[model samples]
Target: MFTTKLAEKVVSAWKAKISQPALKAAQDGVIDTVAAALGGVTEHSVQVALKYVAATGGSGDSKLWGVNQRSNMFDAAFVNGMAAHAIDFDDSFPVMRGHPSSSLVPAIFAVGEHVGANGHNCLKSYVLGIEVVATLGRAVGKGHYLAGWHPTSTLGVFGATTAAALLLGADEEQLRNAWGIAASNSCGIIKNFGTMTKPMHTGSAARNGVLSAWLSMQSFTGCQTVFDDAEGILAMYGAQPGPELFNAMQKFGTPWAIIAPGLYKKSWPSCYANHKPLAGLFAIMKEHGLTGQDISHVDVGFLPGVEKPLLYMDPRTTEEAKFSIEANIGAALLDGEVSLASFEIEHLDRPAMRAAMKKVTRFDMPSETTFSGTTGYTDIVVHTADGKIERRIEATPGSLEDPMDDAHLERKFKDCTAWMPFGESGLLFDRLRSLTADQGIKTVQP
Candidate 1:
């Protein structure tokens, strides 16, 4: 029964079911994720991952986004997945409550390019992947997230697998089996969210998805009943998935969940939980015409669980400051911006700035409040010698309701591409936008 749904979705995905908004969102998702992957190419974790897999590499057919080495399709997926998420700045979906772009895009790009898939196919796979995972994520409920597993890794495996299967031209049985194979490997935990291992979670998921589809293409068998089986993923990893997920495919592209709340594109590279209030800080600065020198102290209040991921983020090094709420706010105020280099080893030691950072404080909002989507909200208070200023970002800026404009998207792209050659990043950004319309996944890496 589940396989039938998988097959129907695969065939119908290419129909007129996809909307224009969905198409544009798919383009943005691919472009932003590419920026993150290229920017992450030089990250420490990426370097470490490359070192471990140094011996085996792929030929020239595929580009590894920002990296120099030519890895095989599998390696390319693995490397690019890790790179996109290395800085923890990839896109998210509230319904799925996990990082969406990291796992899905890599699989789609790798398999699509390898198979010579057109841009339309790539876009369809992307929307299909998001719809499946986000629907399942909503079905899984709190039990899945609070259980110390990374939903992105666990749920994303299935999403990416579906995307890869579509690219490889799998019919229903193969696609369903691909989901089954990915379901078996699904795993990630809130406990590991802050470590380098988190990005690797997505990397493994992306590669596993491709691998599963490839295996299924070769007639390798898998449990066809994985989705509905009693002891399967739904029952185990996701606390007994209810009728919602079982019935979700019926609503698949009608309204299009991918374009509903849309993608949570990050303005800051830190934890998204902290980004909403950080936007408030930026707002206060803009409202009062305050500079780094104008502020005496900053106080930030968020939900109690807010600081959980960054637990023990007491930065012994500068990179760790990126997880510190106070550090992020202070960086926004002082440096006039946030970037990979904004929080550095030396920034943490600047006496005045450190003192300003020390002034940054936060409190938890414990009541279970309703946020329209996956986003949460927080209130910010800034104290300056000149006067006191306060602002509350009712919801995260990147949520579909308050999604970023084209200008903001451009800003984020430039911010990420600043490390690369100017002309190269500009060309790359334009190319990714035209990816789906251009009819191929081959240009994704440059």
Candidate 2:
């Protein structure tokens, strides 16, 4: 009863309210997440995680993208799910304040494919999952993210559950029950940032979501009243829980947030926090073409919360480098761009990169506009060897607001697979561009 009407309303709203543009955006998210997953399959952490997951294989039929091996749906879900987050290039959501797709998509993909589900069903389910998670995040307020919980996993468990339940054709009661189970599975911490284990957080949630849904399918019951219970998710995670949190169901289909912001494709492959500064560097470079040798001191200004994950941290590993704002800033200043190579071990200790990174200092700006959606204002100050210069990057170079342009996104997809042999990368993008037409989700390789 706790989530009965809410569940139906959410399902209905997602179906009706979802517009073409929103659906297109969702498709782009699918493309981006899947591509990132393929790219991640090559990461060192992904390999180690797959090795561990192989030891616990389940019996269901599922394919691990990069591993080129079959696994039980559960174990496969866990490993492939984690691989997607390996590069830190997966889609991010403000509500969960973490990557949402790693948990939701893998569960749905593995389960959906095995059940003979179509692309349309997959798309609808994904929208519902996104709506649920984003609504919960809005309800929880920023305090949840500030408190160090990985917002994506905490809210995303239920979202993934809802999507999986619906795709598997669960009834209203079953759906509500699954949501409750999802709440119980919720967990992840921001403290794990910059480590390989952080990617595992996503895999663990995906694995847990499938387990929850499979258990629910077998008559395993949970608290149906979990949503409105006194100690429900809101009370547990939010500081100032209020009634407004549940209003997302009221206008469920009127305006789809996905279409509004669509999905953000990462221009840089580092920590999301580093983007503001990265954009600042890009802006200055575009305007004056300032290279690494020309710079003196680089002053980057942002909101205080944005700096917590990447403070003065010097990362020795690829994962740690992703967390170092200084490292990424240096990439932008020296290479004039950030990408998969930006976090490599070779680049981390480069002389020019180190020199530029040392010049970087971050501070808080009282006047910077903070948009909850994405792309906050960043002020960058560059002191050239000749004299001091300044620039501020307000949005990412290829965001929806700025728009990556189709050609750029195509180039990005190609660049991501650049390590692959000539023409092989091009073939992959052709397949990616037509994912729905591919009929199955097993076309990627290492």
Candidate 3:
């Protein structure tokens, strides 16, 4: 009856009055997710999804985001989810070991708009979604990721469904049924890390969340004991059960996920794994006035299994470059910056980038071991023409402990929305910054 117990507890947690800080975090999450979508709308994958959503259109109950089109809630969620993750710039949760807002914001907002839900309800749902994703992530542990699961989509699907179901007025039973349905839909693999399909994984999760909740609303049935049954999702996906998981769940909403554990809004749009090391690299460069020509080699050391998901050594494309520490570090060193442009084909095709990437090597620091974000440090050893420089990043920028601050957050949001279709994006950013309860959650244009 773990599922029943958790379901009831989560609903109570969801309905519980949200504190001011938690609501503020939700507003920031919605702002970040939407900015990522608008910024990534120009990506090839998002363009394809835009066309597909337009073709399969239904009721215009939801917006595709960053565009002038609307579609049914399900299709809209898929496209918006795809766009949010297409750039790999969405917010990351430490326990989940991947992006949560990419799926949660798109699914929750799609349904929120459809149901005419208030901004307060929508933000609360976002906070609830994070609780489910991050807490379950602690339960499943890193073995799920090392075994090749993409937690953003796999765990994210459940988070999405939890938030969406609550928004649709689901009780504990219906929400439990929705989770069971979501479990069946849960999937994303590490093998597909550097491709259009990565974004599709999130899109499918968003659709799955909304679809499962809608089905539950229609009296759809699923196993009531989906979390703890012998043949349950946890048994199939988790490493080994631990008391920490239950304890984590028991303490839900007290400190709140966004308040206590918190979310990491990216300063760089690459892999979260790169966040620590890259921050180290950039810091060294700035402090010592080092340029690309000043360095001979860069050796990145991650704790055992930490660097495994960074699959591409000599990446040939932007998508591939996003997951390549070598490519990212090389491009960053040479370009003096790494942004949406750093992963562009021009940056990837740089003979200098190729030359620089070969000089960067990554390996495991077997002596140090831990799992997931904000844990063990990333040691960067830069062998320079002058001498040797080393720095171990103990904290990741953009994390709650080392937040990006208002200026960085605003700059990132505006950069991502510079190409926004309907204009008035400054106004959009302002609205998202101080989102209100009575505010209408609808597509903005003109």
Highest-scoring model, lDDT: 3
**lDDT of model 2 at position 341:** 82
RMSD of 1: 2.4
What is the TM-score of each predicted model, taking all chains together?
0.92, 0.91, 0.96
Candidate 3, 190-225: lDDT as tens digits? 899889999998999999999999999999888777
Compose the digit string of candidate 1's lDDT tens values, residues 1-446.
Answer: 65466557655775545767888899888877877777677777788878766756336455677765566677777878898888877888877777888988988888878888877778888988888886677666656666577787888888888888888888877887777777777877776655678889999999898898899999888887676656667767654545656665566676777788778887777777668777777788887888777887777776644555554335545446656777777677778777767655666677755665666777766657433223666777788886778776777768866787888888778877887865988877777877657556786565
Q: How many backbone clashes does candidate 3 have?
A: 0
Q: By summed lDDT, which 10 consecutive residues of candidate 3 come out lowest?
A: 437-446
Model 2 residue runs over 4 Å out of place are 13-18, 57-60, 239-241, 367-375, 396-399, 420-428, 435-446
Q: Model 1 off-target regions past 4 Å?
A: 1-7, 15-17, 57-60, 246-250, 344-353, 369-374, 386-388
Q: Give the Cα error of residue 76 in candidate 2, in Å.
A: 1.9
Better of 1 and 2 by TM-score: 1
Report residue 430 deviation for candidate 1 (angstroms): 2.5
For each of the candidates, give the backbone clash count: 9, 1, 0
User: Model 2, 1-446: lDDT tens per residue?
Assistant: 33676687665654553556555666677767776777777787778877776566545567776554777767777877788788888777654566778888888777776677665567767777777776666667777777888876777777778777886677777777787787888888878877777888888888888877777887889877676645877767863445555554454545655654445667777667777677666667677867776776788776656776673466677888887878887787778778788778888788877786787787787744344325566777878866777766667544556665667666666666666667877775665445444344444322
